[PDB]
Design a protein around this ligand. Structure first.
Ligand code: BCL
Ligand code: BCL
Ligand code: BCL
Ligand code: BCL
Ligand code: BCL
Ligand code: BCL
Ligand code: BCL
Ligand SMILES: CC[C@H]1c2cc3[nH]c4c(c3C)C(=O)[C@H](C(=O)OC)c4c3nc(cc4[nH]c(cc(n2)[C@@H]1C)c(C(C)=O)c4C)[C@@H](C)[C@@H]3CCC(=O)OC/C=C(\C)CCC[C@H](C)CCC[C@H](C)CCCC(C)C
Ligand SMILES: CC[C@H]1c2cc3[nH]c4c(c3C)C(=O)[C@H](C(=O)OC)c4c3nc(cc4[nH]c(cc(n2)[C@@H]1C)c(C(C)=O)c4C)[C@@H](C)[C@@H]3CCC(=O)OC/C=C(\C)CCC[C@H](C)CCC[C@H](C)CCCC(C)C
Ligand SMILES: COC(C)(C)C(=O)C/C=C(/C)CC/C=C(\C)CC/C=C(\C)CCCC/C(C)=C/CC[C@@H](C)CC/C=C(/C)CCC=C(C)C
Ligand SMILES: [Fe+2]
Lengths: 54, 281, 305, 42, 247, 53, 54, 54, 45, 45, 54, 45, 40, 43
């Protein structure tokens, strides 16, 4: 797969990088919020209910 | 007072009453013959609103209110504790807006530009004239007018709006509401390009008139140019007041029903109105 | 009676190809044919379409938001076009039921497809931002193209994603109807008593009017100087001609205070962004701050008590 | 080529980018492993 | 803040308004200020800096960098007019109009003014004149418009003043801007398309009369119109709107 | 077969950018469709199996 | 293909390929969505019904 | 019938083909949709009846 | 003879029409097969 | 006798059409396999 | 009736042909839809009762 | 004269009209067959 | 676009390699899910 | 490589400074998280 540098012969790196940055940030936000949304997977809720700290 | 280049633009002529009369300038503003009339009425019209407060006794700033007469009194004797105050304060402001608009034409003529600005305002006022002496009287009395109280801020919807239900379903109002968006969505681009060409990237040249087309053409795919917007902006904005005030007229003695039910007239269409399925049928 | 509406003499020819300083001509090719009606009204050039990366990005997500809502609506329509035609603008795409509330476990029928459909319109509107932005960057314009556009998006976002999360429910977002949205806007006022005493809405009430009212005059001032060279506005800041000189004083003589060509366009976007900026924080207060404007307006003496 | 980069320049840039990607992915793998141990989602 | 004000009625809710009261007024000061770039500081009839200037001061003069390699303009710099304002102050006393002393139309007062522009017949960003004569217009032609050739030019006073030969067309806007009406005297007069109102078959000039046709300002280049004349023609042409208000 | 020929007539850059947008949107759509259904909402079944709710 | 091959002369290949690709993807998506809308052919549901997944 | 071929001498082919394609596809779509609404002819519903899948 | 507006020749129009008719006959044949299959499966008369 | 908007040759059009038909046949073959699989799994007739 | 050929001398054949095609199709769809709407001559409807396919 | 705005000749108009009438007769014949078939199947009189 | 036969050859080879890699990952993922929970 | 015109040495120095700042900030964050977790763990 070493031949994959041709895409860098194709794409200006700055714009690819900024798109990637926005992409990664928004995705991490979305996954985190879907997580925290679920009552099952909500580390705050889990800690509150387990340690009896309501 | 005068600008660094104004002086030559003041010539004492063209005035609507008589060419050379009452055309002195009071500092920056101009006061003349028609210059008096709006100043005449607006000066008192405010102060009788102050007298509106004393009839209640309230002085809390917004809590001052001016109360129109109900349907009953009309053109008759009315206690100023109820009316003949809103009825008189009608005289001041109504004369004023006509006075101010027809005032404007003299200085328009003086500087030799079109009557559009007085034409635009005179048509803008026509929305207000719809609200008193037109909509009340078309039924027969000024009771069907909102109070001229500041704290009301047009909170007459209680009986006004919902007699027609969801009132944004006036067909003209459905048209009327949409217009101000069409102006406000387009308004940015002319406020952009002439200003975005006036202000480029700090460190880039000011733009050229050839640059002007290209930005807007590659973006959405169509440029009518500068004048098309100014005309549309006049086509839009006056239509918005035109299609708003006209439907104000047809609330009285034309529509006495709930505005949603009119759209059923399309659902009334005999060809496919009664095919079972979906939401209706 | 010539109030500056129609071109009287019609002249047409080869459209300008376009002028490039830092424009990527790879994305820009082709020209379009000429429009009939607007040639009376004015210009007719329809094109060219910059098939930009963001534009392509907006191209699909808008289209998927465009198309996919259609298909779930047919599931309401029962596959009957005459049914679909009749209750067109009656079909309405609901969000998840409030039991789910914030939680994203919705079924496809019960608002699951809203979050599916709404995510794609969420992509398209934000992606169109740069398509405006980047093209100015190529031509070295101001970024006002961006900042007036974000004005809408900040309030566009709060309708769906900002205001509903602060409570923690997706019901408090807008269902996707042609008429369910309109019933919803009336419904919002009823929910929090009356929306009357909501300030930042009432502030916004002023400024949408300021948009078209002011611009009717602004154009008319330009419409006044189409004789006086109003269409060459760009250098009418630089070379102040009779277009700038005469009408502005009429604004000195009527209003006392006057202005110039450069600063007059500041009011256009700056007043306009009050249309959207004010509501975004304003619509927030009804849900997460003031559950009933009818009592809250009583605090500061604009309500009857 | 839109960009005028050389084969050597693209080689170096790609090597750097892949190094960053592998670092980030390794951190992600560690995180997912930690969560799964703490509370598996399968 | 779950319905929880800080005290009494003042909470984050009113905080937004109280923010909005201060926030608006700052912009309005800025909006008033940024409109103050032509004709400041204020003057009087005599030419003295006026007594009142106002709380809002001049913003910083930013000299713009200009395209085309023509030069630079500093706005707002010292404001200049450089145009004929030979006049008579009707009164030394404060607050009076200014009577035209000699022929005003040469000078340009009231509706007749004409501004000192640049002396460059303006080329486009591509390097060619924005306004191009039809004969010199390579490629473009009269496509679907009422060719004014064949329409007797009529004034306000109902005299046949002339007849059109060509149109000096706006190449960028692709809408006509100027109309060649060479008069019986011999001089070739241009009239902007925008100014006069043509119906299906005639060319009527409602602002000025056929006597003022005789003095319509001449052009030095039969191939390019200069900027200074543009207003100077129109300032001549549009001024008579009130002088020829009778007739 | 042999599909090299498309590239010399049809632009590369647009192909890759459009394909990237397409694939991301498609993956998100399919994932959300899965997540909306009760079965294959793997979070809920993960909760139910380990009976934590 | 005896005579069909001249079609590419009258139609510019680039544009016809773009249009065909758009049309094909839209068609596949539409048909799949229609298929799912039918309760009998909701391939998620059949899986749920068979294995007694609640 | 013999001499129809001058219609191409009359019309530009490519526009004729664009119109023909749009017409044919839209026509097929509307016919199919009406059939699909038609309970007598909704093959997806008919597939259900013969096989006792509900 | 021809009118002269697209500028096609008699031979060009002949060839194009032959190709188009061949395509039309192919498509129509497929349609006939389809209709026959449906009618056998479930007639609509 | 090219007759296009486009300036392609007979040889160029020949090659392009051959490529396109190859792609069409490949895609159609995959579609046939898919439909056969579904029909075996659950016929819709 | 014999010198109807002058009609084409008066009108451009291409525009007339466009008009005829568009008009013919709109017309035909109109009549078909009306018949399909009327219960006597919705030819789909009869086929159900004659064959008792419900 | 030949009063030609379109500029067609008598021969050109003759040929075009013959072609158009042939097409009209073909289409009308198909329509007649269709109406006859429907009337036999279910008369509307 | 002006690409050569050799350039298009190389680009297509690279693209097909990427496609095969991505498809292989997809096949592995689908197999894993089907083993974990089949949808047929 | 002509997007900003920085040298290898300039970029080296700038990156070293930025990484030093990042490590400082991250260290403070680690201390804070440790303090909170000791005070009240969220796991
Ligand atoms: C219960 C915990 C959640 C979970 C919680 C998160 C969170 C939270 C995040 C990720 C992130 C990532 N997740 Mg995980 N993720 C889960 C299930 C999965 C599964 C799977 C089939 O099991 C996969 C393949 C992924 C894949 C991934 C990547 C897309 C990404 C890591 C960086 C990268 O792109 O490389 N997630 C489970 C269901 N994962 C991170 C990310 O967005 O990186 C960009 C991230 O923020
Ligand atoms: C259910 C109550 C209705 C309502 C009830 C009224 C009533 C009642 C009147 C108007 C009037 C006006 N309203 Mg309304 N109005 C509503 C919502 C809106 C919305 C919106 C949804 O964005 C807009 C832009 C408008 C806009 C306007 C104008 C169409 C019209 C004033 C005339 C003019 O010149 O302008 N309304 C709500 C939905 N509106 C008011 C006005 O000022 O008329 C002069 C007026 O009297
Ligand atoms: C004919 C025009 C309409 C009307 C339409 C509106 C609307 C709509 C709004 C105002 C708002 C305001 N109204 Mg008003 N208003 C009317 C009657 C009045 C009366 C009165 C006693 O008659 C007064 C003193 C005021 C005064 C005020 C201003 C202080 C304020 C700003 C106007 C603007 O910028 O536009 N209105 C009539 C009924 N006006 C605006 C504001 O700032 O609200 C906060 C606003 O939103
Ligand atoms: C129908 C019940 C409410 C109402 C419900 C809403 C709702 C809900 C919304 C608007 C929204 C808008 N409405 Mg309101 N609106 C009312 C009456 C009015 C009146 C009027 C004086 O007649 C006007 C001019 C308007 C006009 C407008 C704009 C000021 C505003 C859109 C700006 C934006 O970018 O978004 N509405 C009535 C009283 N309106 C937006 C807004 O600012 O909400 C706070 C919005 O989301
Ligand atoms: C109980 C489960 C964990 C969870 C499990 C994961 C998983 C799983 C992942 C992350 C990932 C990350 N999480 Mg964690 N994360 C949760 C809540 C948090 C919170 C928070 C207070 O909301 C924060 C600020 C973070 C912070 C972070 C980032 C360092 C990182 C995402 C950045 C990126 O680019 O992707 N997590 C809870 C507390 N976190 C991702 C990562 O490591 O990115 C490299 C990742 O894959
Ligand atoms: C129960 C399964 C569905 C079915 C499920 C699908 C799905 C799903 C798709 C197709 C696709 C196609 N279907 Mg099938 N299709 C069915 C019935 C049919 C019948 C028929 C009369 O039996 C035919 C001729 C077709 C025809 C076709 C083609 C239009 C297309 C394959 C590529 C192409 O164009 O060549 N479908 C049955 C009723 N078919 C595929 C496609 O869109 O290709 C572009 C596609 O995505
Ligand atoms: C019960 C009534 C008959 C019927 C009665 C007729 C009659 C009568 C005629 C046509 C003719 C036409 N009909 Mg049939 N037609 C029926 C069913 C159909 C259906 C369908 C999906 O069921 C369609 C799309 C068509 C379509 C059409 C065209 C094939 C043709 C007109 C084409 C044109 O240019 O005009 N018919 C039903 C079954 N149809 C016309 C024709 O022959 O055009 C040449 C014509 O005169
Ligand atoms: C649709 C027509 C609208 C209109 C337009 C309008 N009136 C205006 C303006 C504009 C654009 C001014 O520039 C002018 C002014 O002097 O503003 C400071 C004015 C003005 N609007 C005023 C008030 C006013 N006009 C009213 C009417 C209307 N004016 C409508 C809002 C109202 C309302 C809301 O009903 C009020 C309260 C005056 C103080 C002033 C006119 C001059 C004067 O002193 O009297
Ligand atoms: C100033 C406040 C108004 C606002 C702002 C606004 N929206 C904007 C912009 C601006 C300044 C653009 O120039 C930008 C654009 O590119 O328009 C063509 C856009 C845009 N606003 C859009 C939508 C939109 N905004 C609307 C409303 C408004 N937009 C507010 C009233 C409406 C309605 C319901 O009236 C619509 C339909 C698109 C036309 C466009 C973004 C392109 C897109 O994805 O669609
Ligand atoms: C030919 O046939 C086809 C199908 C192609 C059609 O032509 C049909 C065309 C249509 C347009 C179908 C009809 C559907 C439209 C009419 C939709 C109309 C939509 C509205 C009226 C509403 C618009 C927006 C309303 C609001 C307020 C939206 C909220 C703003 C956003 C912030 C919402 C973002 C929400 C979320 C959840 C983002 C996060 C995504 C999660 C998954 C994390
Ligand atoms: Fe300006």
């Amino acid at each position: 797969m070493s031949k994959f540098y041709k895409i860098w012969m194709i794409f200006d790196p700055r714009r690819v990088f900024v798109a990637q940055g926005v992409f990664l940030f928004l995705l991490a936000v979305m996954i985190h919020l879907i997580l925290l949304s679920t009552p099952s997977y909500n580390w705050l809720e889990i800690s509150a209910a387990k340690y009896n700290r309501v | 007072a005068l600008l660094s280049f104004e002086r030559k633009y003041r010539v004492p002529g063209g005035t609507l009453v008589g060419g050379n009369l009452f055309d002195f300038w009071v500092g920056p503003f101009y006061v003349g013959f028609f210059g008096v009339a709006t100043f005449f009425f607006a000066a008192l019209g405010i102060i009788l609103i102050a007298w509106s407060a004393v009839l209640q006794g309230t002085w809390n700033p917004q809590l001052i209110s001016v109360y129109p007469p109900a349907l009953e009194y009309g053109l008759g004797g009315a206690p100023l504790a109820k009316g003949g105050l809103w009825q008189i304060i009608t005289i001041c402001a109504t004369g004023a807006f006509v006075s101010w608009a027809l005032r404007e034409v003299e200085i328009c003529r003086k500087l030799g530009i079109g009557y559009h600005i007085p034409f635009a305002f005179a048509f803008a006022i026509l929305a207000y004239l719809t609200l008193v002496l037109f909509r009340p009287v078309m039924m027969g009395a000024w009771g069907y007018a909102f109070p001229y109280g500041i704290w009301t801020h047009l909170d007459w919807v209680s009986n006004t709006g919902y007699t027609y239900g969801n009132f944004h379903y006036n067909p003209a109002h459905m048209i009327a509401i949409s217009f101000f968006f069409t102006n406000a969505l387009a308004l940015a681009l002319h406020g952009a390009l002439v200003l975005s060409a006036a202000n480029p990237e700090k460190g880039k040249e000011m733009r050229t008139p050839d640059h002007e087309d290209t930005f807007f053409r590659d973006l959405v795919g169509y440029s009518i140019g500068t004048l098309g917007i100014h005309r549309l902006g006049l086509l839009l904005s006056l239509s918005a007041v035109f299609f708003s005030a006209l439907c104000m007229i047809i609330t009285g003695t034309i529509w006495f029903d709930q505005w949603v039910d009119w759209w059923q007239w399309w659902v009334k269409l005999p060809w496919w109105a009664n095919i079972p399925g979906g939401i209706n049928g | 009676e010539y109030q500056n509406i129609f071109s009287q003499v019609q002249v047409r020819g080869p459209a300008d190809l376009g002028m490039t300083e830092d424009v990527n001509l790879a994305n820009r090719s082709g020209v379009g044919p000429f429009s009939t009606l607007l040639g009376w009204f004015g210009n007719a050039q329809l094109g060219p379409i910059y098939l930009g990366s963001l534009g392509v990005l907006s191209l699909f997500s808008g289209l998927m938001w465009f198309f996919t809502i259609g298909i779930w609506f047919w599931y309401q329509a029962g596959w009957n076009p005459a049914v679909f035609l009749r209750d067109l603008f009656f079909f309405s795409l609901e969000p998840p039921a409030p039991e789910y509330g914030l939680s994203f476990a919705a079924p496809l029928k019960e608002g699951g497809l809203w979050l599916i459909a709404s995510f794609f319109m969420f992509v398209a509107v934000w992606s169109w931002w740069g398509r405006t932005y980047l093209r100015a960057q190529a031509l070295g314009m101001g970024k006002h193209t961006a900042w007036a556009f974000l004005s809408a998006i900040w309030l566009w976002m709060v309708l769906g994603f900002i205001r509903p999360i602060l409570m923690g429910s997706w019901s408090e977002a807008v269902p996707y109807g042609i008429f369910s949205h309109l019933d919803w806007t009336n419904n919002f006022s009823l929910v929090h008593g009356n929306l009357f005493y909501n300030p930042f809405h009432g502030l916004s009430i002023a400024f949408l009017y300021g948009s078209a009212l002011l611009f009717a005059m602004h154009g008319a001032t330009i419409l006044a100087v189409s004789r006086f060279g109003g269409e060459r506005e760009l250098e009418q800041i630089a070379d102040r001609g009779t277009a700038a000189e005469r009408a502005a004083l009429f604004w000195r003589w009527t209003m006392g205070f006057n202005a110039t060509m450069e600063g007059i366009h500041r009011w256009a976007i700056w007043m306009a962004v009050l249309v959207t900026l004010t509501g975004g924080i304003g619509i927030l207060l009804s849900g997460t701050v003031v559950d009933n404007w009818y009592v809250w307006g009583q605090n500061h003496g604009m309500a009857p008590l | 080529g839109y960009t005028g980069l050389t084969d050597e320049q693209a080689q170096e840039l790609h090597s750097v980018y892949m190094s960053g990607l592998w670092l980030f992915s390794a951190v992600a793998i560690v995180a997912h492993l930690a969560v799964y141990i703490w509370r598996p989602w399968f | 803040m779950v319905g929880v004000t800080a005290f009494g009625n003042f909470d984050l809710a009113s905080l937004a308004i109280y923010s909005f009261w201060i926030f608006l007024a700052g912009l309005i000061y800025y909006l008033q200020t940024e409109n103050m770039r032509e004709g400041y500081p204020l003057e009087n009839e005599d030419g003295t800096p006026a007594a009142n200037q106002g709380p809002f001061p001049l913003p910083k003069p930013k000299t713009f960098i200009l395209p085309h390699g023509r030069g630079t303009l500093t706005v707002p710099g010292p404001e200049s007019e450089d145009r004929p304002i030979a006049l008579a102050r009707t009164a030394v006393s404060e607050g009076f109009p200014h009577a035209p002393t000699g022929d005003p139309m040469k000078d340009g007062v009231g509706p007749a003014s004409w501004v000192a522009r640049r002396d460059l017949p303006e080329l486009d960003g591509h390097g060619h004149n924005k306004i191009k004569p039809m004969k010199a217009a390579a490629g473009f032609h009269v496509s679907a418009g009422k060719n004014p050739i064949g329409l007797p030019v009529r004034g306000c006073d109902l005299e046949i003043a002339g007849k059109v030969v060509d149109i000096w067309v706006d190449i960028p806007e692709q809408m006509a801007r100027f109309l060649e009406v060479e008069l019986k005297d011999g001089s070739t007069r241009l009239l902007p398309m925008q100014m006069v109102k043509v119906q299906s078959n005639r060319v009527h000039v409602n602002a000025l009369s056929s006597d003022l046709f005789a003095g319509i300002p001449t052009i030095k280049s039969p191939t390019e119109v200069t900027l200074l004349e543009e207003d100077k023609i129109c300032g001549y042409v549009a001024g008579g709107l009130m002088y020829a208000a009778p007739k």
